[PDB]
Amino acid sequence: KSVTESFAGMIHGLKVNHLTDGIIRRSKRMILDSLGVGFLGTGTEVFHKVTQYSKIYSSNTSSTVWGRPDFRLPPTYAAFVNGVAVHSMDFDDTWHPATHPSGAVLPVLTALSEALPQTPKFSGLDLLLAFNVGIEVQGRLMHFSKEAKDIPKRFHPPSVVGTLGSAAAASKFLGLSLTKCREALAIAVSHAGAPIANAATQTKPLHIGNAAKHGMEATFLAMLGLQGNKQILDLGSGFGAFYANYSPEDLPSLDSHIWLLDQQDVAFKSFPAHLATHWVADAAAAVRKHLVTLFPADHIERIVLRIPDVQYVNRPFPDSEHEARHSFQYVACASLLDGSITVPSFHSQQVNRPQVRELLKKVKLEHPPDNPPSFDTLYCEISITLKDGTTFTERSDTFYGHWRKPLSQEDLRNKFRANASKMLCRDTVESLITVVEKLEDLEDCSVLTRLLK
Amino acid sequence: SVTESFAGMIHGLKVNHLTDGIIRRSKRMILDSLGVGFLGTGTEVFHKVTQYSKIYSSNTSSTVWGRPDFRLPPTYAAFVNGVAVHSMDFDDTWHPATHPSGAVLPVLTALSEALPKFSGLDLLLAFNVGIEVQGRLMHFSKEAKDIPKRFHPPSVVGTLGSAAAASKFLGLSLTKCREALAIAVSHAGAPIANAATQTKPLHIGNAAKHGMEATFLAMLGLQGNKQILDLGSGFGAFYANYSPEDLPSLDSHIWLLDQQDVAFKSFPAHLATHWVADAAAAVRKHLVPADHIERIVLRIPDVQYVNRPFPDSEHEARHSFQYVACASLLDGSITVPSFHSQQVNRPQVRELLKKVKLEHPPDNPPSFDTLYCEISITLKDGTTFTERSDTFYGHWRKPLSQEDLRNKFRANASKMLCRDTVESLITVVEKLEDLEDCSVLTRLLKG
């Protein structure tokens, strides 16, 4: 047969009986983190704009807009705005090969659980199964091109593999047949193109939104019988259009299948910025220990960041939240000036402080050959020379939260608490934590969705 | 920057910049698009996209061309109407390769209805702005001159052209036009493989839809990359060897449509097969005998997604060099019903399809501007006949006359509309220049 048919086979064939306790732990962590960052993102300008746009549409079915119990959107637009919320602050999870896999799946399954209830109630295990199918389809697909393991320079993966992950999760959750799962994937491929250039702008979050949206839309068109190319995932003129040196492979038998999450964990972010800057901040946080026992900003000779050549996060003078989130230089100098980087660190009011500008003017980037542009092998080394000639240097190979040194469950819960506390009552936050941690045992998925408002 | 140059051109151009040529050609393009859309509203693809779209409703709405019994939001109205226009791949063709009219006209129509007076000149201005933007974008990559092999141009340049036309028609500021383009870029990716199947029409639909959506998001103030058209990591992500250039100053600007006409199709198939049919129609003149032929050799470029020696369905038949050749030989002509399943899988067609050999000489590159088709038929007794078509009637080198294009419109639109309504549409489009309000044209689409 074909690789495309293999993907349809994996989506259709996988059952709750194939889920492992490891992927269930990782899935519950991913879901809790995604909900927290979404709730936080509901306060952004981007989420406001996408909800003001979406509100003009209405349907016979509708779904919750996270944190805002006063209005509902069609399931498509609800998933759209919720994915925007999770990716509104570049604060959701990161995986390897490079993508942001949770934001494109969870809002879709939530909207479907509300919008299209099955005659048998949806269970937490059904949500986990569809979630892991989407997470598996993306990533399993990314291993068909080596460049997917590097930080992207052409297309933004969450719009490419995230869209097909959405389609796979929706097809699984609703219960589509083998060939309709295939057709949902083939249709989603024609909704999957978006460039990396918009990463530093107000548009970037919509890459998750549409990824959540379009996949669902493809599934709907697949249910109506709309057909696509039977070999869309193993043609260079099909899905392979998004990757250089595309090299697809058949999927393994379910008897020999191993979930990707059981072998490759996700990284969780501590502050809302590009993952590469999490190395920068860490290195900066170390070197500041030799300078501060307030930072002596008035008399610093220079700041040197040894960091790989990722141009779209090379921003010596960012103006907005979004540019600061994609700025090596701002993250380094802000960590040096304040002593830590958190959410308010990326407010444009804070980014444009005169101390930030004067210290920022001193930041030099250096790209040594030994460190490649990849979240798995990237490092950051920071050197600060004083006007008196003294030079200090510290290096970060792995930061707390990276898949090599993951956040503890307590720290991930506390991130969730701090984020959700702007939208949810305390008791709602604690109950939602409980429900997600015990999601595998949840007889009725409604319990989770009813807490998102 | 080039991006700012596009925003400048879109905002700056006025009705007074419209030329006699681009108006004549725009009226031809619009009439053809309406006819082919009405024809396409009877297809399964239109059914699928309207059964999907009907679930959405908004404060404003717009006409569904073949189904006046309900209304859609202008977004979904443009979606399904563009689908109808591209439902059987019988839209027009332009150079560099794209299908620029199908992605633009439904958007301007839905906007004139949903979000009100717009004049025929305002419609023509926004339409030509979209067409111009598509042309200028395609001139930034060499492969745009060729028949596509990775992305489907109407989903890439058509999306930004739609966004430009919508932004122009609604009246967005300079920077909001720029932002509409930057947002549209993030909605613009679709591969050529789905060209050979039932999904293909949606590439126009989404191109009409997403462009409009981008404009709406721009109107709300959503920002994108201000130099999206100057980055290979931006719009250039869709092209090999992307090399953008500034647009000429309005002091020296020339419309592209005024220099490069569009080709109009005679039968619903990929434009390349229009060479094949023409050549085939010639060679049978020396024969008119399906059972007396040794072989059929069809010289034609290496375009794999129209290389289907044994098609299964409607969509493969529309993308089959071999089927077009064999149907032309058997019937003497190709018409719309020629692509029905019972006509594709008939035994005479199969007996000839088994005989078709393709040859790809260097003289044939995969490009609509330099393509030719040469067909040779050898009989079992050794007799060989050869005929060649370098340009077919309807190609921009031999464009369809007004009589033939009007008759195409009549034949197609009459499937859905009362023929007197068809004549009224002929007059209104022919006289669009003097039309006080677009309402007159859109009312005729109620029928």
Author numbering:
A (entry chain B): 4 to 296, 301 to 460
B (entry chain A): 5 to 120, 124 to 295, 303 to 461
Give the exact sentences the study uses for this entry.
The IRG1 protein, also known as CAD, is over-expressed during immune responses and catalyzes the production of itaconate, which functions as an immunometabolite possessing antibacterial, antiviral, and immunoregulatory activities. In mammalian systems, itaconate production is catalyzed by immune responsive gene 1 (IRG1), which is known as an LPS-inducible protein highly expressed during the inflammation phase of pathogen infection. Itaconate, the decarboxylated product of cis-aconitate (an intermediate metabolite in the TCA cycle), is a small immunometabolite that can control innate immunity and possesses antibacterial and antiviral activity. Our findings indicate that IRG1 exist as a dimer in solution.
The detected asymmetric unit contained two molecules (A and B), which comprise the functional unit of IRG1. The mouse IRG1 structure revealed that it is composed of two distinct domains, a helical domain and lid domain. The helical domain is formed by 270 N-terminal and 80 C-terminal residues, while the lid domain is formed by 140 residues in the middle of mouse IRG1. Interestingly, an unknown electron density was observed in the active site of our IRG1 structure. All the side chains of the amino acid residues forming the active site were orientated towards the unidentified density. Based on this observation, we hypothesized that unknown density (might be from substrate: this also suggested by Chen et al) fixed the close conformation of IRG1 by holding the A1 loop. Structural analysis in this area showed that K152 and D153 from A1 loop formed hydrogen bonds with S381 from A2 loop.
